[PDB]
Amino acid sequence: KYEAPRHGHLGFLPRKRAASIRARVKAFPKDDRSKPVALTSFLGYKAGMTTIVRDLDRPGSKFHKREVVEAVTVVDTPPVVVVGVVGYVETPRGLRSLTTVWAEHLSDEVKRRFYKNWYKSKKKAFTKYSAKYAQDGAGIERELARIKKYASVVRVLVHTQIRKTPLAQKKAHLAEIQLNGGSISEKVDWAREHFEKTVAVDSVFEQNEMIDAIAVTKGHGFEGVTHRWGTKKLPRKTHRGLRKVACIGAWHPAHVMWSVARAGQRGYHSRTSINHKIYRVGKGDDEANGATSFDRTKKTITPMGGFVHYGEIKNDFIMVKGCIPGNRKRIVTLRKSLYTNTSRKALEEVSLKWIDTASKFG
RNA sequence: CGAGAGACCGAUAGCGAACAAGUACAGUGAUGGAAAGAUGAAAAGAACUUUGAAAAGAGAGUGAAAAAGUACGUGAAAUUG
RNA sequence: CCAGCAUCAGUUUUGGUGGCAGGAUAAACCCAUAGGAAUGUAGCUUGCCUCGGUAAGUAUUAUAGCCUGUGGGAAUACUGCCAGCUGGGACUGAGUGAAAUGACGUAAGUCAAGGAUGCUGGCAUAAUGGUUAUAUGCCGCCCGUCUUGAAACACGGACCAAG
RNA sequence: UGAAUAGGGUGAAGCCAGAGGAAACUCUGGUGGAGGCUCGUAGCGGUUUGACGUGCAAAUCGAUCGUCGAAUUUGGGUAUAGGGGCGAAAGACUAAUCGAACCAUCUAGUAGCUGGUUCCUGCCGAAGUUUCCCUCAGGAUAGCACGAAGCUCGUUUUAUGAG
RNA sequence: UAGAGUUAAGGUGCCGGAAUACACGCUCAUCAACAAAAGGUGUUAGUUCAUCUAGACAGCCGGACGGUGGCCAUGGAAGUCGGAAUCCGCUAAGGAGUGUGUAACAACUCACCGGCCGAAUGAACUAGCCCUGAAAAUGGAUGGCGCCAAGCGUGUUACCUAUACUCUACCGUCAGGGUGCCCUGACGAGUAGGCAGGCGUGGAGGUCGUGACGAAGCCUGACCGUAAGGUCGGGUCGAACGGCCUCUAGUGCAGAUCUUGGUGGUAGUAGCAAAUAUUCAAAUGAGAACUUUGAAGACUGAAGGGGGAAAGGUUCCACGUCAACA
RNA sequence: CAGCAGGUCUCCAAGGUGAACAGCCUCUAGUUGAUAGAAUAAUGUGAUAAGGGAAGUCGGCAAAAUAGAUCCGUAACUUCGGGAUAAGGAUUGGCUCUAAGUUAGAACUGGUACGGACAAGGGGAAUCUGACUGUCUAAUUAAAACAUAGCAUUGCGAUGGU
RNA sequence: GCGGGAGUAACUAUGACUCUCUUAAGGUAGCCAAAUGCCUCGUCAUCUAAUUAGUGACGCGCAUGAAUGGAUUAACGAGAUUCCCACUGUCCCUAUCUACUAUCUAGCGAAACCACAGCCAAGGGAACGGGCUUGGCAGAAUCAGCGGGGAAAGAAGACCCU
RNA sequence: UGGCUUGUGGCAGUCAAGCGUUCAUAGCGACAUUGCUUUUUGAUUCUUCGAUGUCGGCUCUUCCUAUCAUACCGAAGCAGAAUUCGGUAAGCGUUGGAUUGUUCACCCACUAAUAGGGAACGUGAGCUGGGUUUAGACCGUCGUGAGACAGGUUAGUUUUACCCUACUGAUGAAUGUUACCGCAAUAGUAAUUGAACUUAGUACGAGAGGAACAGUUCAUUCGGAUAAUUGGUUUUUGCGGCUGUCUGAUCAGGCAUUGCCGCGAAGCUACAUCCGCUGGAUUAUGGCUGAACGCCUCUAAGUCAGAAUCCAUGCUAGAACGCGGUGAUUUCUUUGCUCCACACAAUAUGUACCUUUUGUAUAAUGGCGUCCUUGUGGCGUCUACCUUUUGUAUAAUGCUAGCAACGGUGCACUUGGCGGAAAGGCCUUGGGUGCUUGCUGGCGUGAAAUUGAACUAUUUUGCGUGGGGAAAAUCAUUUGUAUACGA
């Protein structure tokens, strides 16, 4: 009953498909016990990268404040629209509300979405898009919600506004998003001014915190043991056992556990990557790219031309030094970081020195 | 070749074979060699009518009975509604 | 027709409770009186040191050990009784209606003998109004053959018919 | 005894000429003939590697490798049949069988060894021990109870013999 | 062979029926649950003795004396190396010495012993509960829950307890008294094996009885009770077979990698025949990618062109069919 | 046995390119088989590439260097029949011109490269045995086994030896 | 078919030569640690980041020796080791793209093939239990995957004795 | 082979005399033994012939620490530092080559440095087949010999599709429904080290030397993220060279020889880019007040400081963990009106105690009688939950109707308000229903109309009847960073 060393990550079991295109995360990043109102996460779309030629954050370096080449995902963040701020409190059973406080006017892309009109799946009943529901009487009793003592974290059901980013569809992408803030009272009080229609981007993301890069990754294949775990080939490479593996079980006992080196789905969950440090926030048009060299390929920010398989960016973006899962077209969900490691390098803006602009190709 | 009988069978028995069993077949080849019986008194083995394309499905006649209809005794089960 | 099980009245056998007694014996749950040996508690007096106590006298306040003499108590190992009370096995008898072997008692009769059940149950050959889906709960490891020894992870059936 | 090797490279031996040499060596050209000379196809042989083995042939298929005017390859006719035929040898070879072909009969040869083997109840029910064997998974005999007919103890008291 | 009457071996906190009982006791560690040499201020009892108001013992506090460096091992020996004498001193204590210290002096402490204090303390010897010695790999792993009494000894009490024990009847063969058989003794778990008894097929001397106004059989129901398998009854048959009375044979099935065949199984799963592109339109028709025809392309041309012998023998051909069969 | 990826004597010989009968490619001339469409995982089946240059695996197995024509230049030693294409270097086609008609000599330019499809040698240094060519285990042993031209003794006068 | 025991040279160290026993009587030319060596990482030089191969000898021959022959000695090979030059997907180091299928579908239609049953940890035990004792755990309609057990597809084991 | 013992023996405790400068234990240890144990190395036929296939390594699937290195501590016959030794404690890290078949044997270059033990050593239906059970041929050694050997050499079979389970991915369905997502009662997880800037030329020393402790950065290596300044691939779509033949020829265009061969960018990726440590519980050990026990000291009362691991932070998830709301008439075993009145069929706090008949959860469990076979047949009427105990509706006056008094006590529970904020609760005005105590009167006597019937109180479900009311989608066409198919 031996062991051979840990080639590949064990605990992505089961390797379940992330059906919904936007990433979810049950364990949300807990409160900013500093900022009086925030959100927990936000929204993005994966677009492309640039080489930010700047200078180091770590100030005591041997080559301190030199020229530094760096990755950056420049993800488009249009602000999300509220349907209603749901006032989750407690009861003596559990995490149960009392009322929501609706928004009056929603967006336009609420037409096609609020349903589950898809084949081999359940509906919803005729809870369609909004008429004019509970907000008038509901807005005052969320004050009385904290007076219960039985009171929990108040949240807000949101939807996107799409075309603004170059993707042309008008059926919105849904999610609930938790409201953070100072205390339970404050994430209710200041969130009354949030449900009006649209929220702020800058409430959750302060410039130069960190931002944990969760999104939905690509489904690579039905990947075998070589790529999915990390086995080799045998150098004889004949017969049956080329890209196979050896042991799955063991003689004594016959019954093993969930470590075994088999084939199946790779990637494609709502997989969480850790503290990618936020570079800058730029609202409109600032940085460019497009340089005629081989580096890595096919995602170009305002060159001569545009991006391939996305569209040219004329919106409002947030720049994360690092990355975030998906590929082109894929809609992402940027969660914030609860444990912010390094000291916040805010107040002033971070350096942009110069950047190229030409073709990307020949 | 004929007759008679024995505590001597009634289609897995016994002569290879009860019946077109050496004949649709197989092996160069004296040879091996299976499937395989069946109405009634009289065949009268269904005219005629009606539906469907033939198959198939219903009324009507013949005859002692059609609760005998041609693949024609009695009929069980896996199989199979 | 055997076992379980049977109206209603009377009785045996075996053991105990509770009340009582004999064999045989006297300690006790607790039993008198006289003389001598002993020595505990309360109260008083006296002496000495010290603020807290102690020693001696106290038969002259009240009471006892252990022995001797005299006198008086004394329910039970074993064994039987009461059917007061309490639980059962076991026997006799009931329209009409026998024969043989008995006892004691009576103007009476009972015990004891000796003559005679009813339905299913296991299941091979001549039964009750019957086949049977079937909760819940408890018991619960099936052969022909070898060997001291296989439900066993020894051999040997889809299933039916021929031999 | 009949049929088959296109194409392509060299050339001793024999014989002559020309320059040169005392003479012979040397030395320059032509004429010419013997090849396991020699080279590539026909005919013809089998080193490596992958896929098959319930599939196309009862040892198969793909990629890859050898020889050829010599100890050359091949067809047809005809002859040799089991202790014989036959050998540069490997009992290779003979109808997928060859260390003695195959077919049929005597033959249902035989198996001191192993396995399998068909109603029930009742009466009633042991033994794994031995003298002994060219004798050992056996069996003559003896120990113990089968079956059937007719009949058969000891508890313990006096001593005697032996560690 | 069955229900009662009484109890063994052994159990009662709980899984799972029965004391969370009673009395006394060490110990409370979850002891209970392996282990020696060898060892211990847990903690209790008995016996003997040193020791004690004749001032036990501890802590704290002193005198550390004169002879004197006693003497002697030895290079040196110094109380302080080895070995012997064994005191005086001052006669209310200091030995010719308990321990440390420097080669050693130099330095220091004290049983012996002094001074405060004022009651039971201490060595042996014996016994018990504890306690130290004790490491290995899949999930409690020295119990599931867990228990500090729901542990254990000693003494006691209550409840539970073998078809045996035990009551009485019943089943099996045989004996005696007296037939017909009844009373009735002793035993009855069971494999080989023998005997007895009972059920059994084909067949038969016998054969009358039953039968076409409904025989064997098929199929289905009732269906006695000793394990063996057989009588009656219902739907139905269209000719066969038993009273009586006894004799005879190829005479009872679960099995040797067996035997005669169908049917199951993997399974409607794989296979569906060596990688020389196929696209589009028509004729005919019930049905057309396939026959057949046209347009167009892949493809080979020392053969996909041409063509004789062995061997086979009418398979060519035209006519004619779509069933079995590809 | 088979409507099986098979065994199976044996006939005839055009064009231009490359010796012939390789290859190349059209004629005379013939034809894609007794099932089919769409996507095109894991896994088994084809090629490309940075940097390194043997470091890896029983295993240079696998994989790489190189290649023609013509000229120069080149190693021990012989059974004198030999080794040589050793090593070490240099250049091509095409077109013009030499000559109004093999072939070779002069002359000019360009590209990644003149054999441009196709096609076409790795070399240096030390060492064994059977002389050479040849025979071989039919379903797990291609060799040092045995033969080989040649040589000797012995049987042995053939009416031999056998 | 082709010997033993004993004694013996300056000096560490050795036995030329000599004697004695035994038997029918005791070997030359030339070579050695083997397809044969117990003893032996023997003993020495050179090579190697270590290097016993390459190549240089040592003598310490368990047990070399001339016709089913020593020995001279050139050519030839799908046969056998090492050093040396250029170098290499074998590996470092894996990625990417491509042909065909898997996924999925139609048709007709295999294969040997028939145990009640299908958790694990501890415990007893025909002796390594999903199956038996306790305790923890364990639902069904469905498809694609992958090589660990049970021990597959199969033949009365290959060792081993009669 | 498995079992057994530990033979042959390994390890430790350790008798501790010796000997190391004095000196039983810094160290060395005569002489050996006791317990443990299963490793050197084997005793035994206990259990096995219708299989019990070998070694070193590649690859991938565990657990323990008889402990090499990382956290924490103490001591020396140790000057700091080099050197020497012992305790708490299993989360993680644990090299590259050469000799040799080969770990053993035996050597080198570094590096922070290169552990121990078991587990069918994962381990031939994943893998090599060098190591490892037969068959060409030769030598040594032995026997009369065919031939043999406890001695060596040369060639000489790894077949195929996993029945059941382990098991890794993807869909389909269960207390109205439900697109969409947060709790953390729980499940899976991640992990290491060095150098340099710099601390400091300070501590301490004869001399070589150079400690405590900070702030700062980065390089080996792993996983997840990874598509821009890198490195390459890109048959898709474009660009360079050579041969033959056809389309009538020239020519303009094609098939064909891998993408013919020669050179880029879609589409992907690394040889590459980005990122990564909170609170709680306690041990060795040291003290703190103070014992057991006049002094004393960490423990009996009393009371604190305190370790990688432990344990949680950080991320995934069938209330036993995808929480659960707004707003409202579902994919789906399956019947399906948004209304609500009457009637009917069965079950229940542990569904008791128990027992006979082919047939008891069940009345044995008001009282009395006309009828009346009679210990029969037949006819008529009916009084909670919950609690106490001998038991428990427990309840003594022939029945029924009417009236009066003490003037209290119980329950359901509307209307009206306040407040908790899901456990939904109470109180009181108007209103509704029932009960205590005492007295008095009557008991004759008849129809309308209709029928199949219940352990029918209660609760759940269903049918019949009746009056005012009423709405989402499945398919499929076409596509994605959605991709295996699904979702």
CA A55 – CA A343 distance, rounded (Å): 17
Please check whether residue A115 is in contact with residue A128, taking contact to mean a CB–CB distance below 8 angstroms: yes
| Strand H lies under 7 A from the Cβ of residue A155 | yes
CA A89 – CA A151 distance, rounded (Å): 4
> For residue A226, what is the enclosing H or E element?
helix A225-228
> For residue A274, what is the enclosing H or E element?
strand A272-276
Tokens linked to A311: 């569209």
State this model's resolution in angstroms. Answer: 8.9
**Nucleotides of strand D lying closer than 7 angstroms to a protein CB:** 49-51
CA A1 – CA A260 distance, rounded (Å): 13
Q: Å between A246 CA and D83 C1'?
A: 60
Q: Å between A343 CA and H55 C1'?
A: 61
| Strand E lies under 7 A from the Cβ of residue A252 | yes
Name residues whose C-beta falls within 8 Å of residue A54's C-beta, 6 or more positions apart in sequence: A67, A68, A70, A279, A350, A351, A352, A353
**Nucleotides of strand E lying closer than 7 angstroms to a protein CB:** 138
Residue A227 DSSP SS3: helix
Q: Å between A330 CA and C80 C1'?
A: 111
> With helix as H, strand as E and coil as C, how does A159-224 read?
ECCCECECCCCCCCCEEEEEEEECCCCHHHHHHHCCCCCECCCCCCCCCCCCEEEECCCCECCCCC
Beta bridge partners of A41: A335
CA A200 – CA A190 distance, rounded (Å): 12
Name residues whose C-beta falls within 8 Å of residue A202's C-beta, 6 or more positions apart in sequence: A281
CA–CA distances in Å: residue A271 to residues A44, A151, A341: 16, 31, 20
| Strand G lies under 7 A from the Cβ of residue A218 | no
Which chain A residues 329-348 have CB under 7 A to strand H?
Answer: 329-330, 338-339, 341-342
Within 13 Å of residue A275, how many CA atoms lie on the same side as its CB? 10
Amino acid A103 reads A
Q: Å between A157 CA and G2 C1'?
A: 117
Which chain A residues 158-177 have CB under 7 A to strand F?
Answer: none
Considering all CA atoms of chain A, what is the largest pairwise distance in Å, rounded to the nearest integer?
77
